[PDB]
Amino acid sequence: DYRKKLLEHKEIDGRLKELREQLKELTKQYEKSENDLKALQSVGQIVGEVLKQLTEEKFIVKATNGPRYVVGCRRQLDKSKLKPGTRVALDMTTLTIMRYLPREVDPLVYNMSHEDPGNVSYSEIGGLSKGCLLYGPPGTGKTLLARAVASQLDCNFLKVVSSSIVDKYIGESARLIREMFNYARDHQPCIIFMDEIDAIGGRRFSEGTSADREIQRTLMELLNQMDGFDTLHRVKMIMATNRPDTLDPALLRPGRLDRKIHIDLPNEQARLDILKIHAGPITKHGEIDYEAIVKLSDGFNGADLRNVCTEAGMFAIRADHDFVVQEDFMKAVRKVADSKKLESK
Amino acid sequence: KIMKSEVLRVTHELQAMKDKIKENSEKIKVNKTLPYLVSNVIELLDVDPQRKGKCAVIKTSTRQTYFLPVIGLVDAEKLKPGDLVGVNKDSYLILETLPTEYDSRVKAMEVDERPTEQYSDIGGLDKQIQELVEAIVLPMNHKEKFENLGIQPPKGVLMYGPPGTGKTLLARACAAQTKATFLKLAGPQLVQMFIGDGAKLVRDAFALAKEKAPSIIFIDELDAIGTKRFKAGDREVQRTMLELLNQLDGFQPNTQVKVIAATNRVDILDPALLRSGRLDRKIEFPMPNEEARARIMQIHSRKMNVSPDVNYEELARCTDDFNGAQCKAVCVEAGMIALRRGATELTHEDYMEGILEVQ
Amino acid sequence: MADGGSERADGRIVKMEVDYSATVDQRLPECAKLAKEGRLQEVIETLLSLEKQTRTASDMVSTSRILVAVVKMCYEAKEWDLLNENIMLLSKRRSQLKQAVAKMVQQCCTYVEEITDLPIKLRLIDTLRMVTEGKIYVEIERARLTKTLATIKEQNGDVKEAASILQELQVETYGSMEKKERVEFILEQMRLCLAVKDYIRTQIISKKINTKFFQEENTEKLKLKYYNLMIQLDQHEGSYLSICKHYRAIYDTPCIQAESEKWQQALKSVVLYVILAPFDNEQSDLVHRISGDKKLEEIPKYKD
């Protein structure tokens, strides 16, 4: 009688205290609405540029539209940012200065913003313990690793695509080799990725045309800046490709590519580790046996092993079964992997 | 319960807040009614040293540059360098941002809602088309099971084979089953007179696929521009093409709308087209035999008044090394001269008459 | 493919049991062409991880009972890149080289305690020239041989090699990323300095010592002991300012170890650097870093 009323009143108090969270959470956003409505009251600002300063207090501004004006100094700001050569902002009333406007390339934001999150990718590369060559034996992952450390820190996102040395006009790409590598020599930290270099890696065996001679001339600038009269002790380049046969044996000198990393799945612990990191979100039956999948797989591609395992998960979803036994893994990874061996020419 | 009696005052304050938000929330309609012009927005992060640094660069349509910080409501897809933003008369604030992509010559390339033909128009290809029918039905309805199993559908499917096989009308026939928006694109459309057009066409395709609703983008004649030359125009198509491959390799959020491709020949096979997001689904579509051609010609000719005395042996013998769209042209031609033959019923000589007529 | 050299390996280890060094001279042409061939990158790795164990196993059998070591040191001392001179395509492996040098220093480590005083000076004088002739290494064994020789030079009484170990240490500490081995090998900088006592060398080496290291990525346990062993010799060379920035960072030492013995050293030197602190600015603010600690008032010098 008395002992039950404390628990019952605890239940009424429970259902009474469980209704505040449905309102007090959205009231912060509702008040944030009026906070923004009070934040949109700072309006009517214009821009300008400073060329010549006569008086330390009042100088000449240059507007983007073309007409020039002169403004004063606001009591809040100081003479630090007031020096000429810094783009600033102005107001329509009294031509006061609220703050400055830092310059940037319309494109510099694109070249300095593309970023890729994910910090576990550095430890999701599997059992893998002045230039690096990522060649193309029967095993993939050249992009998941470079994008794994590049997604970890990379200190930048200086990606160099092999399609940026096209130079449709006269082949003066030396301005871009010295321009971008001059940016690499300017910025103290720099990491360079060179993916799919086989397209620009012509062996120039026979007499090349004008299209090949300019690309091989950019390769001559690469020679002149790797083993020429310029060291590359601090900058690092990652030459990724697809076929390790046409990789410019003139460029295959060990003076540039110190080590060679054959991206494959040789070790049973590396294939088992990559199989376990790719087999994370998949659900299976209690019968688990990875040694048959790892043992039967010999010299395959990592991401394509993910595509074959998920292809076996779809072969198992054809029968719309929630649980997925490893029989379709052995027979579907077996048969589909044999089809990859057929299409591995 | 004496300590829990103060909750009533809190609920009265909250319902009073809901009663008082109607006015300041009501002026949203009269202040944010209509942005009268369109102004381009360029994102540029500033630093104030709360007193936090946040600003943006504005450009009006009349070529006038002004100054304003990043303001408005809660932004999720905003803060991108886009156009068609909300702005009042003279205060120049940002109220309603909406992406423009406007250059309608590329935006309105092929505005198709849905086609008429379906997958039940062919015969003898279920063993090789069933994988594609699954690969378009299960990624559209079974998104829930993709989290229990951890499955991400591939975005590049290579529908390759000899020409004239009707792969375009067949992929469109499956696009009727996709129920999504169908958007064609031709290979020779990337080669333009001006420079950098292919970047606008590719970023436009991923602008409508990325921005718009879940759709279907089927391209064809990709082999006509997929040449791996070692100036050259196909190397410019290597700039645009390798740019697209960079947008299918460097973009992990590419889990959105797929990109279906079809090549009429595999002579110049680009080796860089092998990836989970790239053209990994390589299902070979050979030339249909006389049996399969009699099947697709029978189902494509099931509407005309065909004579029941068809043993398919004469047409099976005459159809040697033919294709799907060729027998479709024989069916259409038979439906063309069968009208002027007087007999409303399709005869048996019209098959070889059309075969020797158009071929 | 290594399938040809594997049979020669596992068969050679069985057939090579009692034969003298002449059969090794017969093996020289058998392994010269075997090292010249095998262009495969990942396949011949086993052939180089077996054949080297066959020739070094024959070196173990030859060095087991009787050893003159003259012809032994002449074979490797005269034949280093004989197989690397005909092959114009350097496979840039750098995978079995670390196992090569590490296995050589492992066998020399099993033969380095007490075998015969004569060949050790020529073998070590050979490998320290191999340090200079290498120019490409992880900088682990190159420091290992010269510090395990320098330890013998400590009791040998010849301190002339200080310029050698401390001159080669700069080369052995730049060009690679060493976190643990750099601190374990950095004590040699101030190890022989008690015998050398060169002021300009102390000026070159806490300068080269404290370049980039504050707390992290370097654990031993005995870190504070080496901290006391770092700037105390700069107090020997300096007069008073050397400990102003030294005795201000030992406040975490009582937190790491027992606080019983910290009263005699840490809480004694907690006042000397603020007494010897400059009178301009550091005296004004540095007196507040020690004020407030409950252990400060317990010292009888608190009134001072």
The partner residues of A60 in beta bridges, in order of sequence, read A70
Element (H, E) at A236: strand A236-240
Helix axes A302-317, A327-342, angle to 10 degrees: 130
For residue A49, the surrounding DSSP H or E stretch is strand A45-50
Find the angle CA(B244)-CA(B247)-CA(B248) to the nearest 5 degrees.
Answer: 90
Report CB contact under 8 Å: B272, A196.
yes
State yes or no: A66 annotated in a binding site: no
CA distance C215 to chain A (A): 22
Tell me: is residue B161 an annotated ligand-binding position.
yes
Among chain A residues, the shortest Cα distance to B195 is held by A168
- Residue A341: enclosing H or E segment and its boundaries? helix A327-342
B167 annotated among ligand-binding-site residues: yes
Does B124 show up as a binding residue in the annotation?
no
CA distance A236 to chain C (A): 14
Whether the CA torsion B66, B70, B73, B74 is positive or negative: it is positive
Nearest in space to B218 (alpha carbons), one of B168, B293, B278: B168
Rounded Cα distance, A255 and A257, in Å: 6
Q: How many CB atoms lie within 10 A of CB A169?
A: 9
| Chain B residues 303-342 with CB within 8 Å of chain A | none
Q: What is the resolution of this structure in A?
A: 6.1
> Is B255 an interface residue toward A (CB < 8 Å)?
no
Do the chains contact at B149 and A281, CB–CB below 8 Å? yes
A246 is in an annotated binding site: no
Tell me if A90 and B152 make a contact (CB, 8 A cut-off). no
Nearest alpha-carbon partner for B71 in B52, B89, B63, B60: B52
Looking at the complex, report in whole angstroms how far the Cα of residue A250 sits from the nearest Cα belonging to chain C.
11
Count CB pairs under 8 A between chains A and B: 161
Residue B165, annotated ligand binder? yes
- Residue B351 and residue B358 in contact, taking contact as beta carbons nearer than 8 Å: no
In angstroms, the CA B311 to CA C160 distance is: 107
Q: Do A168 and B195 make contact, defined as CB atoms within 8 angstroms?
A: yes
> Which of B46, B150, B252 has the CB atom closest to A280's CB atom?
B150
What span, in angstroms and rounded, lies between the C-alpha atoms of B234 and B226?
8
Neighbours of chain A (3+ CB pairs under 8 A): B, C
Name which of A231, A247, A260 to mutate to probe chain C: the one with the most chain C Cβ atoms within 10 A of its Cβ. Answer: A260
Rg of chain A taking only CA atoms, in angstroms? 31
Alpha carbons within 13 angstroms on the beta-carbon side of residue C128 total 18
Maximal CA-CA distance, chain B: 98
C177 to chain A, closest Cα gap in Å? 13
Q: Are strands A236-240 and A131-134 parallel, antiparallel or unpaired?
A: parallel
Residue C32, phi then psi, degrees to nearest 5:
-65, -55
Cβ atoms of A69 and B90 closer than 8 Å? no
Helix (H, G, I), strand (E, B) or coil at B219: strand
The answer to whether the annotation marks B166 as part of a ligand binding site is yes
SS3 content of chain A, % helix, strand, coil (to 5): 40, 10, 50
Environment class of B191 (CB within 10 Å of its CB; exposed 0-12, middle 13-18, buried 19+): middle
C41 interaction partners in chain A (CB closer than 8 Å): 260, 262
Bridge partners, residue A69, by sequence: A61
CB C266 within 8 A of CB C254: yes
* Terminal Cα-to-Cα distance of chain C (whole angstroms): 81
* Range C215-232 burial, b when 16+ CB lie within 10 A, else e: eeeeeeeeebeeeeebbe
**Which of B132, B147, B231 has the highest number of chain A CBs within 10 A, making it the mutation to test binding with A?**
B231
Best of C39, C92, C96 to disrupt the A interface (most A CBs within 10 Å) is: C92
A258, closest residue in chain C (CA to CA): C92
Count A/C contacts: CB-CB distance under 8 Å: 15
What is the layout of strands, in order, in the sheet containing A257-261? Answer: A159-161, A191-195, A236-240, A131-134, A257-261
Q: Which residue type is seen at B320?
A: D
Residue whose structure tokens are 């009294």 = A94
State how far the Cα of C105 lies from the Cα of C141, in Å rounded to an integer: 7
Task: Check C94 against A259: CB less than 8 A apart.
Answer: yes
B103-132 residues touching A, CB cutoff 8 A? none
Angstrom CA distances, A210 to A158, A162, A204, A221, B357, stand at: 29, 18, 12, 16, 48
Q: Hey, are the CB atoms on B145 and A9 less than 8 Å from each other?
A: no
Q: Tell me how far CA of residue B17 lies from CA of A23, A110, A236, B14, C89, in angstroms.
A: 11, 43, 59, 5, 80
Chain B CA closest to residue A201: B230
The verdict on a CB contact (< 8 Å) between A104 and B65 is no
Q: Which residues of C56-83 are buried (b: 16+ CB within 10 A; e: fewer)?
A: bebbebbbeeeeebeebeeeeeeeeeee
* Tokens linked to C45: 């790795």
CA proximity to A226, closest of A139, A130, A327: A130
DSSP string, A79-139: SSTTSTTS-EEEESSTT----B-----TTHHHHTT-----SGGGG-S-S---EEEE--SS-
What is the rounded distance in angstroms from the CA atom of residue A294 to the CA atom of residue A299?
10
Q: Which two tokens stand for residue C154?
A: 């400590």
Q: Is B324 annotated for ligand binding?
A: no
Between A24, A43, A195, which is nearest B92 by CB? A43
- Residues A240, A142: contact at Cβ < 8 Å? yes
Question: How many DSSP H helices and E strands does chain B contain?
Answer: 12, 8
Resolved by? cryo-EM
Per DSSP bridges, beta strands A191-195 and A236-240 are parallel
In chain A, what residues touch C89 (CB-CB under 8 Å)? Answer: 249
| Alpha-carbon span B260 to B167, nearest angstrom | 12
Q: Dihedrals φ, ψ of B331, to 5°?
A: -65, -45
Q: Do B7 and A210 touch (CB under 8 A)?
A: no
Do A and C touch, 3+ Cβ pairs within 8 Å? The answer is: yes
Which helix (H) or strand (E) segment holds residue B18: the answer is helix B7-24
Which residue of chain A has the CA closest to B28? A37
Task: Tell me if A161 and B246 make a contact (CB, 8 A cut-off).
Answer: yes
Q: Does B227 touch chain A (CB under 8 A)?
A: no
Q: Is B166 exposed, middle or buried (0-12, 13-18, 19+ CB in 10 A)?
A: buried
Token duo for residue A119: 């910090």
Nearest CB partner across the interface for C42, out of A249, A257, A266: A266
- Tell me if A258 and C41 make a contact (CB, 8 A cut-off): no
Comparing CA positions, the residue from B354, B299, B350, B339 lying closest to residue B166 is B299
Shortest Cα distance, chain A CAs vs residue B276, angstroms: 7
Backbone angles phi, psi at C149, to 5 degrees: -80, -35
Contact by Cβ (8 Å): A82, A95: no
Extended strands (E) in B112-258: 156-160, 181-186, 215-220
- Strands of the sheet with B181-186, listed across from one edge: B181-186, B215-220, B259-263, B156-160, B279-282
Using CA atoms, how far residue A340 sits from A290, A303, A307, A310, in Å, is 20, 13, 11, 14
A257 contacts chain C (CB < 8 A): yes
All residues at 6 or more sequence positions from A19 whose CB lies less than 8 Å from its CB, including other chains: B11
Between chain B and chain C, are at least 3 CB pairs below 8 A? Answer: no
Q: What one-letter code names the amino acid at A258?
A: D
A258 inside 8 A of chain C by CB? yes
Burial class (CB in 10 A: 0-12, 13-18, 19+), A55: exposed
Nearest CB to A310; choose among B66, B71, B151: B151
- The closest CB to that of A258, out of C42, C89, C92, belongs to C92
Are the beta carbons of A307 and B7 separated by less than 8 Å?
Answer: no
Chain C residues near any Cβ of chain A (below 8 Å): 41-42, 89-90, 92-94
Amino acid sitting at position C216: E
Burial class from Cβ neighbours inside 10 Å (0-12, 13-18, 19+) for residue A101 reads buried
Crossing angle of the two packed helices A174-186 and A210-226, in degrees rounded to 10: 30
A254 with C42: Cβ contact below 8 A: no
Residue C141, phi then psi, degrees to nearest 5: -70, -35
**Residues of chain C contacting A128 with CB distance shorter than 8 Å:** none
Q: Do A166 and B236 touch (CB under 8 A)?
A: yes
Q: Do A210 and B69 touch (CB under 8 A)?
A: no
Check CB contact under 8 Å for B134 and A20: no
Residues in A touching C137 (Cβ below 8 Å): none
Contact A336, A312 (CB under 8 A): yes
Do C94 and A262 lie within an 8 Å CB cutoff?
no
Contact indicator for B91, A44 with CB cutoff of 8 Å: yes
